[PDB]
Design a protein around this ligand. Structure first.
Ligand SMILES: CC(C)(COP(=O)(O)OP(=O)(O)OC[C@H]1O[C@@H](n2cnc3c(N)ncnc32)[C@H](O)[C@@H]1OP(=O)(O)O)[C@@H](O)C(=O)NCCC(=O)NCCSC(=O)CCC(=O)O
Ligand SMILES: CC(C)(COP(=O)(O)OP(=O)(O)OC[C@H]1O[C@@H](n2cnc3c(N)ncnc32)[C@H](O)[C@@H]1OP(=O)(O)O)[C@@H](O)C(=O)NCCC(=O)NCCSC(=O)CCC(=O)O
Lengths: 424, 249
């Protein structure tokens, strides 16, 4: 680099000035490491649903960001700040929780700058609203259409040095804020970075995330900061927390449940796996996505379908990557539980729900089993276009009669137009 | 919560003022993780003896607190503080080791406050004496019969955020003290919190405790703070240290 002394000017000068002002804040830091396994598993499920929907893609910062907002609501003291009004120490209680995102902006000039853009009124959002507000801020920041109002009113900040791979950090707290939360790397500890996946899977080692809380000690106590981090840790492994996210993102499957690994004692896990296979072949239709409406009839008895959960068969998330003998299932002798679950769900829980296991003839049952597990073959574009023509004809015919003969009984097929391509 | 601006007054105002004064102390922190298995096993044995005797019950803070006192005696520099007397930098060497306990006090009003009550003259106590003095301070704090003398003369502080489950912390150092010791959570690392007890037992994974030392860098060197934490780690797994406690109890 070119030596010399160059005056600091522009955004960098304002950053330097703010850091000098921050020297007057006596800060303390709490550090807590949290299991991240369930965050990896459940985020994958959400992203899988978004992929089929052809939507977006959530990140770890979205989940941690939202969990952080929930934790601030549970511990409102973390949102308070300090100030000297009229020469007296005053505790400022903000009216909303405005979450500041530390966004790294590599400029076109060459230099990179960090800005803290605010997501305002997060206390009155669900995950869907939060994600939209989050993406809006990030999108505008990249194109650079951030107004002055975006930078004002930050009550609490979130920074994510863990993206680069920093384990944890001790950041600086800006004046006018109570606390800043740092998110560390979501990875195996360094002592496990050389270990094989087999040995890690066998032992049941999970990834962790380290979260730090740097707070103004004049207004926030150490116990409050500690309890705040404890709440965040609980939320990230809470069934209710993940149920809320799944409902917001419209995920049909039950979220993976946090549970301890079970020993391969008593009934062998190979036995359990093949019981799971028979469960899906028999009763997989009970949870199949066959209903176009998100509708359950009040007063219709909901059947029990616990047989389709791995917990019922004494299997856990820690068995997912373990290999089991599946006795020719999917034309393979051995398979991981993850692959078994994937194949079972693809064959029995998507748009087609089959009941055939009740059939007594084995040749019949095998014939149906082989075809259902092979799946629907990909249709040609000509075939796809032909299906559309039939759908169009069905709907357009019904609509034409509605227009020309409005007050005449016809018993329309509207809502069941797929009957025409089915019959065809 | 109801928004608005409320002046800070009472105990909270004094806390805020002290934290502002603490800005003039250049502090550094040493962090050390220590095996906690033997502490779990031997504490259980002591509590078993107290149960049959129908006595009390010791905690991890009692053991760590006592080990900390022993380590300060081995490294007296950790007890020294800094001050400006007559406009000259002076190294203050206290006459006793007065251990300050950070006691969280959820008041009946609703708000919670932290106070640092001193256990005085800990350098001339055994474990039995230390435990009695510790319990006396804690007992009086709950009922609220602490005098002004209890808050004065603190030479070294001990805080335990590990009860809530904080792994470790970087606390603030109060003026007139050399160092503060933070005790982290005594638990398995997060990467093992999903593992079965069978697999953990088979491998031989033990629980750990993380201890931090935040000290005034003007009077205490980093090497001294490091050696202090090393001594504490040795004591908690030393046969002689545990023999002393067993004999006392
Ligand atoms: C606006 C955000 C926050 C949005 O980030 P997002 O996490 O939503 O998305 P992203 O970064 O594009 O994510 C890219 C990939 O990284 C992964 N990823 C993200 N955070 C991660 C973490 N903590 N650990 C592990 N992986 C992580 C995502 O899952 C994703 O994987 P997939 O591809 O599989 O989905 C962005 O600008 C950002 O990440 N900024 C970094 C914050 C920063 O620079 N802070 C300054 C540190 S100042 C500080 O802390 C001072 C102290 C100090 O550190 O020294
Ligand atoms: C006076 C004391 C210190 C007495 O505590 P004791 O440990 O003797 O008893 P206790 O807390 O009632 O203990 C209850 C149970 O918790 C267990 N326990 C205690 N400490 C533990 C630790 N570090 N890790 C794991 N378990 C722990 C005990 O063994 C006991 O289990 P059993 O039931 O099996 O016996 C108390 O008030 C206290 O714990 N205060 C906490 C200090 C505090 O709030 N500091 C503020 C942080 S200020 C700070 O550090 C700034 C930086 C920051 O952290 O942000």
């Amino acid at each position: 680099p070119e030596p010399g002394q160059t005056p600091i000017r522009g955004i960098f000068k304002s950053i330097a000035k703010n850091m000098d002002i921050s020297l007057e804040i006596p800060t303390a830091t709490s550090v807590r490491d949290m299991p991240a396994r369930l965050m990896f598993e459940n985020r994958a499920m959400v992203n899988d649903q978004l992929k089929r929907t052809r939507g977006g893609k959530i990140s770890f910062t979205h989940i941690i960001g939202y969990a952080m907002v929930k934790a601030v609501m549970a511990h409102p003291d973390m949102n308070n700040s300090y100030d000297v009004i009229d020469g007296k120490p005053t505790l400022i209680v903000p009216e909303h929780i405005n979450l500041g995102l530390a966004i790294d902006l590599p400029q076109k000039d060459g230099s990179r700058a960090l800005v803290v853009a605010a997501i305002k009124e997060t206390e009155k959002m669900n995950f869907s609203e939060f994600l939209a507000a989050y993406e809006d801020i990030v999108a505008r920041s990249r194109k650079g259409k951030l107004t002055m109002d975006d930078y004002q009113g930050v009550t609490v900040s979130l920074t994510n040095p863990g993206g680069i791979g920093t384990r944890h950090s001790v950041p600086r707290l800006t004046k006018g804020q109570g606390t800043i939360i740092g998110v560390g790397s979501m990875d195996y500890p360094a002592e496990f970075q050389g270990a094989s996946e087999d040995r890690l899977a066998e032992l049941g080692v999970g990834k962790l995330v380290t979260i730090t809380s740097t707070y103004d000690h004049r207004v926030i106590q150490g116990a409050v900061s500690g309890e705040f981090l404890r709440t965040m840790s609980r939320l990230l492994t809470d069934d209710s927390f993940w149920d809320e996210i799944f409902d917001a993102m419209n995920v049909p499957y039950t979220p993976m449940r946090w549970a301890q690994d079970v020993p391969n004692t008593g009934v062998d896990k190979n036995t359990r796996v093949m019981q799971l296979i028979e469960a899906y072949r028999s009763r997989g239709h009970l949870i199949a996505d066959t209903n176009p409406l998100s509708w359950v009839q009040p007063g219709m008895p909901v059947p029990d379908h616990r047989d389709l959960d791995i917990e019922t068969h004494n299997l856990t998330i820690w068995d997912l990557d373990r290999t089991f003998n599946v006795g020719g299932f999917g034309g393979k002798e051995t398979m991981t539980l993850r692959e078994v679950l994937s194949r079972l769900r693809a064959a029995y829980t998507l748009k087609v729900g089959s009941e055939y296991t009740h059939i007594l003839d084995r040749d019949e049952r095998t014939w149906l089993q082989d075809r259902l597990e092979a799946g629907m073959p990909k249709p040609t574009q000509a075939e796809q276009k032909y299906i559309l023509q039939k759908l169009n004809a069905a709907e357009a015919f019904e609509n034409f009669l509605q227009t020309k003969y409005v007050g005449q009984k016809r018993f329309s097929l509207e809502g069941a137009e797929a009957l025409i391509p089915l019959m065809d």
